[PDB]
Design an enzyme around this catalytic site. Structure first.
Site, mmCIF file in Angstrom:
data_model
loop_
_atom_site.group_PDB
_atom_site.id
_atom_site.type_symbol
_atom_site.label_atom_id
_atom_site.label_comp_id
_atom_site.label_asym_id
_atom_site.label_seq_id
_atom_site.Cartn_x
_atom_site.Cartn_y
_atom_site.Cartn_z
ATOM 1 N N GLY A 113 0.799 -1.225 0.000
ATOM 2 C CA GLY A 113 0.000 0.000 0.000
ATOM 3 C C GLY A 113 0.829 1.273 0.000
ATOM 4 N N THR A 114 0.144 2.412 -0.084
ATOM 5 C CA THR A 114 0.803 3.720 -0.111
ATOM 6 C C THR A 114 1.289 4.085 1.289
ATOM 7 O OG1 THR A 114 -1.064 5.212 0.401
ATOM 8 C CG2 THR A 114 -0.886 4.425 -1.887
ATOM 9 N N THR A 115 2.205 5.045 1.369
ATOM 10 C CA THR A 115 2.797 5.434 2.648
ATOM 11 C C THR A 115 1.843 6.311 3.462
ATOM 12 O OG1 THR A 115 4.997 5.420 1.601
ATOM 13 C CG2 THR A 115 4.833 6.402 3.803
#
Lengths: 111, 231, 235, 241, 195, 243, 250, 240, 244
Positions: F29-31
């Site tokens: 996933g994204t940060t």
């Protein structure tokens, strides 16, 4: 003991002509010897050229009208936008009313 | 492979293959396009028939006076999900006298699809939906996927060969976004977009489906002879 | 095994696709829609000569304005017909009117994907639903165990279907009379049937606005079979 | 080999899921130790805060179950907190139903019963934890009672749990062989804590700062955990010796 | 409803049941048969609350007929009367009890004996040489106490029954429109058509 | 083997491989991050702009619980929403019975127990999200991070997603250089910088920054989104630092 | 969530074995030896208290349990399984008997109830069988003294004397040579101690051995006086000291 | 509750649990129905590896559902008891509500419905049973004979057989039964029924059962001697 | 989910047999043989105990022969614990009938209901079947003395003489040879014991490895008595027929 019913007064009147029909009602809303409102409409356009009034105990009247309006909406959804004829509306309202047979809507309904 | 027997099983790289296979059904579906300006939102759908004797499968479904959607993939799942949306819009009206915000509609669909991805016995929904609407913050377009991911866009497309329409809309963004107060021009731009996804077939009168909602326009569907104007 | 509601890697439900294979093993059923009515015909296909063929009931009434033909695991159709009949009669009770053919068909198709781990498997039978209503006139629908239903001008289902459908593609036009439709169902049934078509191993029926849904006697159908043989010998 | 995936018997009468739940017990690589004084029960556990971004005050495997009962866990924290919440609820319900505070040993039996159920019922996995309950019981005095994923439990003079448990156990065994008694013959809980830390140092062969340890003390009518400063104060006294 | 009587004689049980069905100030029917055949040698008469009477009678009938088919055998009059009693005993503590009183007249083929059971709506069972329900007993019991003998013929039983109906027709306030009389013996159940 | 095919099964080394596989979805996933400050907490997240067609500012990822708690997560987004929906139910019933708004440690365990419960049976799947959350209660500010296993701790700073290592390294510098504490307004700026620094590990697609905060002095102890001038100021500080 | 395991986990194999029951009996075989001996005026049940660590207080772990004032139990196999069976056995003695008849169940019937519980763990959905064999010793007015064995299958048999667990084969042979129908209770205790010594590896004393008797009524253990017909429990656990006394005259 | 979908589709579109239930029927003793001009006869094989049987009390292979309808079967005996009980209950319920006994078609349709339901309900297997249902509708003198099978399909038959070696006796019936002229008497109909079983049975000693059903609830079972008279007569005309 | 671990106890094999029923029958074939013989003036039940140890308390023992009511008894072959579950159900069912009709339950009706319960476990619920076969011995005023057997399938049949458990093939052959219709009870007793004596897997048939019972009209005029034999009585009858 809590009495779940009341009487909001008012009177209504429907007459059918050859190619028209009227549904009239006064706009006074009362409890006991007081006026609640001098203008509270109780005759409504429900769509599909049907007008309706459920007169007596206003809370029940509003509930029924609300349920029937909703029934018209779902009739369109379920039967390809078919127009709800007045005779079909009448039978539908019978079932709405009789469904509460043992705890009735306190209203004289006219469409 | 060994991890695709049900939705409740993660693969070793963290994937959900049943959800991915559900996504695949959408890719086999017939193309449908969504786009909007600041005053209107439009859906355009290419309908698919079984053969020359059959009708064309409906792709667009009305949810309320101010909201509706188009589908690609399993049509019965769209019937279930659109019915849920009809009820949610309806609940909002009856209880709060409030039209359901398109954004909440998106959140509600997300959470409904999500539950089918975390428990044994069920399956993910096999349909993608494009929801358009006009509410108290203007025109809206949403893309729903059965993974649960819902996304608000200016324009998009789903189904087979949808990539062409999506690329076109990406190019035309600055133009179509400002087609305000002009329904027919917003539709024409949508019809041009969906044409980028055609192959060995062209838009005909019982082939094309269009819907529009906006500032002073209830969600209304156009079919048959009423879309000849745009072919 | 593996879940009953599982998707294949191609995005199709295993169980629905497999039920479609069972329908292909079913006896042939054909429907043709005209502006004078819809004709429904079926191959009875008795498994033995001792079986009394009039007891084979693959054409069925749903209401006076709606009829139904079936193909596949025909025992699976009984509860579908039972739902259809109840849906039709219930609508008339609530609304003092006839229920539209499409709404009926949508109601039957709502049962289809109600399976999983609801019933244990999809239905193994396809239905041709034919009827009349005032809004959309004469209609024919093909109801599948996928929950999908297509409206058709003409449709064949069962073992002989793909050959029969190609035949219906050439023969159907928008001006067919009811008599032409009757003869056409008989003709295409004789083509795809294993045994020689007669009035005992094939059945006809129709639905008209005036007289409603009617199954034909074996005497009536026998005459149409003779009439079809005479037309085909005559050039 | 599905007899290894759920809690049914293998052909040799074993429960592999229970055995594998025991191996999960050491996954945190933390050793705990418990001893009894005359007046008190002391439990100490290693505190390892490897990440610099953690708030060290929230890293704990010791729980205050009731006013009188404390519990240290050896095993992953999610399972540890699962057991802690249930034990708290059980202890509170007991008091409401029966009008007196739940004894340490009775809570241990109850939690052991729940654990036993997970070894017999298929749909519930065992918790990958060992639970050491401590108190100064009003009837039985200073008490140590320990629970495991097999649903086994027993009282102890002293006990140890973790990867290096055997070293600590034999260390404590040897001391009681010498001392000839069931407990640490000391008046103040401060000195019982000092004993506990001293014998952990010897057994593990490692020195501790104030942040490498975590201490829980049970006295009559209350169980409490020490702050870093209370532990530092204790480490100092050990050094000046 | 109202009048149901029963007499067990030497070789048979005789049931007499009134023909009137009255609602309000109108006699709606004067040929009502207040009886159901439970098995070929067992007959049950009934009186009580409107609706309840027939519903109960037919429910018992269906159950005894089911038993007969299942076992290819006729249940004894004693066994049938115990089943009926238990159903009424269940009923008296339900949300809405069956308000039905019954007489069961049967011929036990194994014993070669007629048997008459009186059961009220509470499930109070009693085997009797003669029985009645409601106000009927207040006139007939004393009359039967006097004229009844245990070795009477079917003919004598009918004459004794005639005497009871005559007394009822003299002293009862209501017009019950005569009775239908049925005889239960070794050959089964038959109806006397002139009473 | 076959120990990894069913949730809640212990492998011979005592691991639940399905939870470990859920972690892989989170790492994908994204940060997202959290920074704890003087009198509050700051949350920020990387939103990959897949296309020009995404309406900017209108696919909001950070979520409020009650009126004082913020939540952000990386991994399967719908799973994160499910978790917040539950958290909202938990907070509502706490306030209903006890009147006072749910304290952050209490709320942390409510999510913890719920996530842990999804590692107990083979009939549910573990959560495919790591969730960073927190706010201000009567005892000051708290920042928490919760994993698929149900494991959570209190944090000075927290990071998860594809750029977690880069973000963690940057968080450690701030903790080392500011023992006395970071201010709420400074933490917003730093959060912007870190998301930009963490975007290097996800640099194909360009992104949109989203920030929220709860501060006793700046937001009166309520959760608010950072927008407009304060947000642009933070974006500028971040741009200024990668160059 | 909730149990999806509504199906049996014990099923017949092609050869007709019930695998899980056999495997439960194997777990019982690995268990520490326990035994029971029936005398003319009493019964004795005994077992070794195999301690896990010397730091453990083995007095807190009781393998011999009172079920009713006149009935006691001991076992071989899995301890935690036994512990919950004792909880259930104690309760069922009340709910299905004492609360109905105002008196405690006779030995055979309490045994019958335990057997039922163990049988249901062999057929019900989502459970494994119990991994224990029980020895239940008791007394009741109309049957006198009795000794029963209850196995994982739920089968139970009355014994004059028997052993279960580790060295049960050797112990049963030893009991066949020693048992007669004239044994007095004190003689049975002596034979029980001899038998147990053969299977015990380490220390053999009143702290490593657990032993209880079903014998005469103990009015001093009743806790009250004034009701002549209430005479006290027939179950008594021998103390550590009382065992050591008998081990010098061994 | 136990839930598993046991009856499901295979890739070729077969429901194996239904088809394996037919194999159980194929293993059952042969049952045959033949309808004459004025009666229906049900004949049943009983296997002869069982001497020491008590025939007074052993469950008969033909069962009365009501006084005018009978049911025989091939397959699992225990399964058939459940179908028989349900049919008997429904027969009485029909009399109670409609005030008329069931028609043979109706009773068959009910039994078939139960069987079908057990092929698409979770947690149950199909009935390993096929039935022959015969009798006369109330106030009707036209004979009725129906067959049901595990899938739930049912149909009317002039004559039909089920169970082991039924393909051999169907063979016989197909070439020996004239649709144009059904056995004009009870005598003739019982004889054709016994002949068809003698193709497959063995010695027709205690091996064959016969039950004759006539209009207006006239049902009777033949004894061994009466059956043996047919066996003897059939074998005398055989030597040719 | 849990589908992985489900044996599917209620499915057909490709041959149309119920796996679990077949395997339960295989289990029962290793159980001690039980014989029932019906005579004109009563019934005999005889059963061999499973390899008894010398220390087993024989007089307070019950493993094979159980009393359902005063007129009906059963002999058991299979898992004893499974049988007790069913026996208690049968006892209750008998009392329900007595309470309802004020008449003792006819033998077949009791047998049918027990057999129907067994059948249920083979068709629905996903549970293992009861690993038990019964021999029912009883009397009622409709059919007099009757013998039945039921097995895990829930199939039941009536018999003049029958065996269940081990060596039924050999045992049945012997009964078929020496049984005759006019036979009295005392002859039936002898046949039962002599049959077990020849089919037993033990070295020699003794009193301590047997349970024995008779149902006669051996009390006082038209009334039936159940005699469950004591160990000494079995020892006597074993000598009286010259087996010991």
């Amino acid at each position: 003991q809590f009495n779940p019913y009341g009487d909001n007064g008012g009177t209504i009147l429907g007459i059918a002509g050859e190619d028209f029909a009227v549904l009239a009602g006064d706009t006074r809303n009362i409890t006991d010897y007081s006026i609640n409102s001098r203008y509270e409409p109780k005759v409504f356009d429900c769509g599909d050229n049907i007008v309706m009034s459920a007169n007596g105990f206003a809370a029940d009247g509003d509930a029924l009208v609300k349920r029937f309006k909703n029934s018209v909406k779902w009739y369109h959804f379920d039967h390809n936008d078919k127009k709800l004829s007045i005779n079909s509306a009448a039978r539908n309202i019978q079932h709405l009313l009789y469904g509460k047979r043992f705890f009735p809507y306190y209203v004289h309904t006219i469409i | 492979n060994n991890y695709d027997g049900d939705t409740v099983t993660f693969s070793p790289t963290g994937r959900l293959f049943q959800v991915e296979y559900a996504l695949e059904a959408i890719k086999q579906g017939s193309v449908t396009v969504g786009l909007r300006s600041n005053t209107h939102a439009v859906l355009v759908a290419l309908k698919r028939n079984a053969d020359e004797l059959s009708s064309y499968q409906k792709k667009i479904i009305k949810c309320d006076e101010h909201m509706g959607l188009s589908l690609a993939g399993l049509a019965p799942d769209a019937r279930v999900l659109s019915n849920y949306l009809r009820q949610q819009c309806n609940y909002s009206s009856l209880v709060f006298n409030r039209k359901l915000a398109v954004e909440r509609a998106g959140h509600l669909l997300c959470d409904k699809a999500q539950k089918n991805t975390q428990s044994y016995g069920g399956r993910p929904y096999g349909v993608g939906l494009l929801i358009i609407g006009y509410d108290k913050s203007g025109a809206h377009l949403l893309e729903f996927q059965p993974s649960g991911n819902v996304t608000e866009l200016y324009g998009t497309a789903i189904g087979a060969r949808s990539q062409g329409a999506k690329t076109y809309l990406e190019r035309t963004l600055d133009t179509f976004i400002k087609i305000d107060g002009n329904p027919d021009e917003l539709i024409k731009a949508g019809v041009e977009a969906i044409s980028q996804s055609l192959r060995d077939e062209s838009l005909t009168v019982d082939n094309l489906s269009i819907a529009i909602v906006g500032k002073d326009t209830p969600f209304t569907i156009y079919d048959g002879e009423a879309v000849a104007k745009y072919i | 095994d593996r879940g009953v509601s599982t998707f294949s890697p191609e995005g199709r439900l295993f169980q629905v696709e497999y039920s479609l294979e069972a329908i292909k093993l079913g006896s042939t059923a054909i429907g043709i829609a005209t502006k004078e009515g819809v004709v429904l015909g079926v191959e009875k296909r008795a498994t033995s000569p001792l079986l009394e063929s009039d007891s084979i009931e693959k054409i069925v009434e749903i209401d006076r304005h709606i009829g139904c033909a079936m193909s596949g695991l025909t025992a699976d159709a009984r509860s579908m017909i039972e739902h259809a009949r109840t849906a039709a009669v219930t609508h008339n009770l609530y609304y003092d009117e006839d229920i539209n053919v499409e709404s009926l068909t949508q109601s039957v198709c709502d049962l289809a994907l109600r399976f999983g781990e609801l019933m244990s498997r999809p239905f193994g039978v396809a239905l041709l639903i034919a009827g009349h209503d005032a809004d959309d006139g004469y209609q024919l629908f093909h109801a599948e165990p996928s929950g999908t239903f297509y409206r058709y001008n003409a449709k064949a289902i069962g073992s002989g279907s793909e050959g029969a459908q190609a035949e219906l593609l050439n023969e159907w036009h928008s001006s067919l009379t009811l008599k032409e439709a009757e003869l056409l169902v008989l003709k295409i049934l004789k083509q795809v049937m294993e045994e020689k078509l007669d009035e005992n191993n094939a059945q006809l029926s129709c639905i008209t606005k005036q007289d409603g849904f009617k199954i034909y006697d074996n005497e009536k159908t026998a005459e149409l079979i003779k009439e079809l043989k005479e037309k085909e010998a005559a050039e | 080999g599905y007899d290894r995936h759920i809690t049914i018997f293998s052909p040799e009468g074993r429960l592999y899921q229970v055995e594998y739940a025991f191996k999960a017990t050491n996954q945190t690589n933390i050793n705990s130790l418990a001893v009894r004084g005359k007046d008190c029960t002391v439990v100490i556990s290693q505190k390892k805060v490897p990440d610099k971004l953690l708030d060290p005050t929230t890293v704990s495997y010791i729980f205050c179950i009731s006013r009188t009962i404390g519990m240290v866990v050896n095993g992953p924290i999610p399972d540890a907190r699962n057991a802690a919440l249930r034990a708290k609820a059980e202890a509170a319900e007991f008091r409401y139903k029966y009008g007196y505070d739940m004894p340490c040993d009775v809570l241990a039996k109850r939690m052991a019963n729940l654990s036993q159920i997970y070894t017999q019922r298929a749909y519930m996995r065992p918790l990958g934890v060992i639970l050491t309950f401590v108190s100064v019981d009003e009837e039985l005095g200073p008490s140590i009672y320990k629970t495991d994923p097999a649903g086994y439990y027993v009282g102890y003079k002293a006990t140890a749990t973790g990867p290096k448990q055997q070293e600590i156990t034999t260390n404590l065994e040897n001391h009681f062989k010498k001392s000839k008694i069931d407990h640490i013959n000391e008046e103040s809980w401060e000195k019982v804590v000092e004993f506990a830390i001293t014998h952990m140092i010897d057994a593990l062969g490692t020195e501790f700062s104030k942040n490498d340890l975590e201490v829980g003390v049970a006295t009559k009518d209350k169980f409490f955990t020490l702050s870093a400063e209370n532990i530092e104060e204790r480490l100092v006294a050990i050094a000046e010796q | 409803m109202d009048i149901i009587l029963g007499i067990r004689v030497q070789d048979s049980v005789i049931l007499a049941s009134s023909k009137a069905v009255t609602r309000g100030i109108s006699v709606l029917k004067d040929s009502d048969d207040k009886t159901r055949q439970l098995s070929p040698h067992t007959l049950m008469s009934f009186a009580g609350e409107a609706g309840d009477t027939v519903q109960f009678a037919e429910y018992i009938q269906a159950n005894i007929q089911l038993y007969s088919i299942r076992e290819d055998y006729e249940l004894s009059p004693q066994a049938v009367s115990s089943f009926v009693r238990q159903e009424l005993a269940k009923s008296i503590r339900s949300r809405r009890p069956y308000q039905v009183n019954v007489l069961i007249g049967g011929y036990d083929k194994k014993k070669n004996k007629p048997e008459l059971y009186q059961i009220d709506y509470l499930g109070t069972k009693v085997e009797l040489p003669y029985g009645a329900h409601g106000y009927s007993g207040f006139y007939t019991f004393s009359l039967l106490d006097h004229h009844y003998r245990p070795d009477m013929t079917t003919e004598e039983g009918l004459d004794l029954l005639k005497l009871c109906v005559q007394e009822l027709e003299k002293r009862m306030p209501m017009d019950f429109k005569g009775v239908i009389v049925k005889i239960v013996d070794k050959d089964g159940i038959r109806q006397v058509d002139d009473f | 083997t076959g120990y990894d095919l069913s949730n809640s099964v212990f492998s011979p080394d005592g691991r639940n491989f399905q939870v470990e596989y859920a972690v892989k979805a989170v790492e994908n996933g994204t940060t997202s991050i959290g920074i704890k400050c003087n009198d509050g907490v700051v949350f920020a997240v990387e939103k990959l702009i897949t296309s020009k067609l995404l309406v900017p500012q209108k696919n909001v990822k950070i979520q409020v619980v009650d009126r004082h708690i913020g939540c952000v997560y990386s991994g399967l987004i719908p799973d994160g929403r499910h978790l917040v929906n539950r958290g909202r139910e938990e907070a509502a019933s706490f306030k209903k019975l006890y009147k006072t708004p749910i304290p952050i440690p209490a709320f942390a365990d409510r999510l913890g127990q719920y996530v842990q419960a999804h590692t107990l049976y083979n009939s549910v799947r573990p959560f495919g999200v790591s969730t960073i959350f927190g706010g201000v209660d009567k005892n000051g500010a708290h920042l928490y991070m919760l994993e698929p296993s149900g494991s959570y701790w209190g944090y000075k700073g927290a990071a998860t997603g594809k750029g977690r290592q880069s973000a963690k390294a940057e968080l450690e510098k701030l903790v080392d250089h500011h023992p006395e504490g970071l201010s709420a307004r400074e933490a917003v700026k730093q959060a912007a910088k870190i998301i930009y620094l963490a975007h290097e590990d996800n640099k194909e697609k360009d992104f949109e920054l989203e920030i929220s905060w709860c501060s006793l002095s700046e937001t009166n102890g309520l959760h608010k989104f950072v927008k407009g001038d304060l947000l642009q100021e933070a974006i500028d500080f971040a741009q200024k630092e990668i160059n | 969530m909730t149990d999806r395991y509504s199906f049996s986990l014990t099923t017949f194999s092609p050869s007709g074995k019930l695998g899980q029951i056999d495997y439960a009996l194997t777990a019982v075989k690995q268990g520490v030896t326990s035994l029971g001996i029936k005398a003319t005026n009493g019964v004795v049940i005994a077992t070794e208290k195999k301690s896990s660590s010397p730091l453990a207080m083995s007095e807190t772990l009781s393998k011999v349990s009172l079920l009713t004032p006149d009935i006691g139990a001991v076992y071989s196999g899995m301890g935690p399984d036994y512990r919950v069976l004792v909880d259930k056995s104690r309760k069922v003695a009340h709910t299905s008997y004492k609360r109905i008849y105002g008196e405690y169940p006779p030995t055979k019937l309490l045994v019958s109830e335990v057997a039922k519980i163990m049988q249901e763990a062999t057929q019900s959905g989502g459970v494994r069988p119990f991994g224990v064999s029980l020895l239940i010793a008791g007394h009741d007015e109309f049957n006198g003294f009795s000794l029963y064995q209850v196995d994982p299958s739920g089968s139970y048999f009355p014994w004059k004397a028997t052993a279960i667990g580790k060295g049960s084969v050797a112990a049963k042979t030893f009991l066949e040579k020693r048992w007669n129908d004239e044994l007095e209770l004190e003689d049975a205790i002596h034979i029980a101690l001899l038998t147990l010594k053969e299977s015990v590896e380490g220390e053999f004393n009143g702290d490593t051995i657990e032993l209880a008797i079903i014998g005469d009524e103990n009015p001093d253990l009743l806790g009250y006086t004034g009701i002549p017909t209430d005479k006290g429990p027939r179950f008594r656990k021998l103390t550590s000291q009382e065992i050591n006394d008998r081990l010098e005259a061994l | 509750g136990y839930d598993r979908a046991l009856s499901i589709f295979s890739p070729d579109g077969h429901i194996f649990q239904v088809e394996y239930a037919l194999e159980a029927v194929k293993r059952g003793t042969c049952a045959v129905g033949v309808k004459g001009k004025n009666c229906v006869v049900l004949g049943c094989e009983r296997r002869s590896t069982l001497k020491l049987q008590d025939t007074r009390i052993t469950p008969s292979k033909v069962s009365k559902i009501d006084s005018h309808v009978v049911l025989s079967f091939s397959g699992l005996n225990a399964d058939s008891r459940i179908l028989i009980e349900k049919a008997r209950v429904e027969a009485q319920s029909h009399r109670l509500t409609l005030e008329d006994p069931v028609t043979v078609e109706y009773l068959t349709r009910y039994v078939a419905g139960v069987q079908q339901r057990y092929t698409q309900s979770g947690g149950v297997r199909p009935f390993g049973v096929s039935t022959l249902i015969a009798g006369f509708d109330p106030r009707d003198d036209e004979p009725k004979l129906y067959q049901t099978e595990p899938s739930g399909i049912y149909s009317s038959w002039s004559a039909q057989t089920i169970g082991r070696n039924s393909k051999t006796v169907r063979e016989f019936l197909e070439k020996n039964y004239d649709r144009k002229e059904p056995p004009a008497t009870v005598e003739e109909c019982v004889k054709l029924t016994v002949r068809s079983l003698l193709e497959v049975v063995q010695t027709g000693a205690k091996n064959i059962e016969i039950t004759v059903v006539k209009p207006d609830s006239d049902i009777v079972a033949l004894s061994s001697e009466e059956i043996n008279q047919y066996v003897t007569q059939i074998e005398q005309e055989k030597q040719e | 989910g849990s589908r992985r671990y489900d044996s599917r106890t209620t499915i057909f094999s490709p041959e149309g047999r119920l796996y679990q029923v077949e395997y339960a029958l295989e289990s029962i074939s290793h159980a001690g043989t039980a014989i029932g013989i019906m005579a004109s003036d009563g019934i005999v039940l005889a059963a061999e105990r499973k390899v008894t140890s010398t220390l087993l308390e024989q007089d307070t023992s019950t493993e094979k022969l159980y009393k359902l009511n005063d007129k009906i008894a059963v002999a058991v072959a299979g898992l004893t614990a499974d049988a007790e579950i069913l026996i208690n159900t049968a006892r209750i069912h008998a009392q329900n009938y007595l309470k309802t009709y004020n008449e003792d339950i006819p033998v077949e009706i009791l047998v049918r209901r027990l057999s129907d319960i067994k059948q249920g476990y083979t068709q629905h619920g996903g549970l293992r079947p009861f690993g038990v076969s019964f021999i029912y011995a009883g009397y009622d005023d409709r059919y007099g003395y009757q013998l039945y057997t039921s097995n895990p399938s829930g199939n039941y049949t009536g018999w003049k003489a029958i065996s269940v458990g081990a060596n039924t093939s050999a045992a049945q052959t012997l009964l078929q040879m020496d049984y005759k219709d006019d036979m009295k009870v005392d002859d039936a007793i002898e046949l039962a014991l002599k049959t077990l004596s020849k089919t037993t897997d033990s070295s020699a048939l003794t009193y301590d490895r047997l349970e024995f019972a008779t149902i006669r009209k051996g009390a006082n005029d038209g009334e039936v008595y159940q005699k469950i034999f004591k160990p000494q009585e079995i020892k006597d009858i074993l000598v009286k027929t010259g087996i010991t």
